[PDB]
Design a protein around this ligand. Structure first.
Ligand SMILES: COc1cc(N2CCN(C)CC2)ccc1Nc1nccc(-c2cn(C)c3cnccc23)n1
Ligand SMILES: [Mn+2]
Ligand SMILES: [Mn+2]
Ligand SMILES: [Mn+2]
Length: 334
């Protein structure tokens, strides 16, 4: 607790109506997370609402947000069209021992959109609109000069610009890194965590595409595709849909043995611990066709499933690229 401004988690104690810097009036809490808090604030100088991300008062979180700041400014440097899929940082300042990042205020997040459907999912047409924008934001991050791995793609970090419009932007580069410059082994939110991160292998921009494949299914069905309770359970649920990962991946995977075991002359198989639910039927027995259930032709559903399976390829080299996804027949008349 610093002068009484911080709670026990080193989060700033948000008080509605408080005035900061004789400029910002705090209205309400938007969200909490590992990083800290996001608040809705009124900028009295410009007479506009903003969102303010208040980083936790910890050396570690302060240090990690230096990176997030640098990456946000990098993504704003040039006059590109693609950069407008990113919520852009208006400014940053220090306030009572907290680094504060000011963003344009958006309306709500993709989890809110799903809850408004009673978690039944959105139409295939809206899933398509959202997916093509998300693929484009990934194409942008893959630009060589950026080479940014978002590392925390998930519904909470995908915001709708306007309540009656399907435009989206992405937020939360607080765990992002650039290619090769990976600096954490336990990354991504668990439901959206890729096999290579689960397996401890070197990861690259493809981990975001894995997340995106998970998200598109959730958008359509209303529910997370792989809602694991821990990493072993996360692997188990992935394997139940997509089968055993390829031997070339498991052979070079430091944590292969956390989930899998070797059969003499039988390759790799899932370790059968008590973490496995009793009704578990085997690898690939929860077909994606049945998860999806029974612009909306049955051919459109088959194209959607095809795109999702290319996003959920185990081998990152084999997983569809942002450009490949954009050229996929799910989106394109040709
Ligand atoms: C009223 O505005 C919002 C309301 C909500 N909520 C979410 C809960 N439901 C129940 C209500 C609606 C969610 C987002 C917004 N707006 C908004 N606009 C800009 C940035 C951010 C932002 C969110 N996150 C996780 C971030 C992480 N890093 C940086 C920036 C952000 N959020
Ligand atoms: Mn700056
Ligand atoms: Mn995050
Ligand atoms: Mn459903």
């Amino acid at each position: 607790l610093n002068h009484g401004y911080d709670d026990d988690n080193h989060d700033y104690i948000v008080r509605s109506g408080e005035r900061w810097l004789e400029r910002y009036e705090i209205d309400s809490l938007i969200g909490k997370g590992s990083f800290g808090q996001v608040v809705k604030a009124y900028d009295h100088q410009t007479q506009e609402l903003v969102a303010i991300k208040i980083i936790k008062n910890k050396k570690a979180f302060l240090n990690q947000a230096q990176i997030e700041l640098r990456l946000l400014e990098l993504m704003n440097q040039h006059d590109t069209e693609m950069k407008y899929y990113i919520v852009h940082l208006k400014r940053h300042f220090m306030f009572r021992n907290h680094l504060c990042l000011v963003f344009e205020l958006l309306s709500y997040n993709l989890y809110d959109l799903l809850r408004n459907t009673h978690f039944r999912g959105v139409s295939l047409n809206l899933t398509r609109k959202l997916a093509q924008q998300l693929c484009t934001a990934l194409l942008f991050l893959a630009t060589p000069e950026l080479s940014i791995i978002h590392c925390d793609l998930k519904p909470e970090n995908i915001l709708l610009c306007n309540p009656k419009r399907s435009a989206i932007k992405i937020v939360d580069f607080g765990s992002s890194c650039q290619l090769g410059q990976r600096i954490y082994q336990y990354i991504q939110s668990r439901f959206y965590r890729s096999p290579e991160v689960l397996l401890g292998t070197p990861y690259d921009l493809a981990i975001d595409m894995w997340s995106l494949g998970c998200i598109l299914v959730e958008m359509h069905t209303g529910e997370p595709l792989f809602s694991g309770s821990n990493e072993v359970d996360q692997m188990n649920r992935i394997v139940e849909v997509l089968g055993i990962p390829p031997a070339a991946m498991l052979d070079q995977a430091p944590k292969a043995r956390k989930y899998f075991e070797r059969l003499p002359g039988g390759g790799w198989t899932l370790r059968r611990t008590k973490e496995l639910r009793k009704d578990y039927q085997g690898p690939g027995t929860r077909r994606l066709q049945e998860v999806l259930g029974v612009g909306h032709s049955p051919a459109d559903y088959l194209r959607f499933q095809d795109l999702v399976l290319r996003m959920l390829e185990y081998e990152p080299a084999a997983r569809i690229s942002p450009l490949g996804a954009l050229q996929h027949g799910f989106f394109r008349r040709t």
